[PDB]
Amino acid sequence: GSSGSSGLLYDCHICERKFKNELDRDRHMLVHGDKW
């Protein structure tokens, strides 16, 4: 059993893509929020 020294911390609830910061994920949610 093995695991990496680093990883992605934040996740999209629309398309399951992941990010290093809350900011990087939060501005990605705008690509889904455009479908108003």
Alpha-carbon span 17 to 31, nearest angstrom: 12
Judged by CB under 5 A, the residue of 8, 9, 11, 15 near Zn ion is 15
Judged by CB under 5 A, the residue of 10, 12, 19, 24 near Zn ion is 12
**Residue 28 assigned to a binding site:** yes
Environment class of 12 (CB within 10 Å of its CB; exposed 0-12, middle 13-18, buried 19+)? middle
Q: Is residue 19 a contact residue for Zn ion (CB under 5 A)?
A: no
Q: Which is nearer to Zn ion, 17 or 20 (CB)?
A: 17
Judged by CB under 5 A, the residue of 8, 9, 14, 23 near Zn ion is 14
- Three-state secondary structure call for residue 18: strand
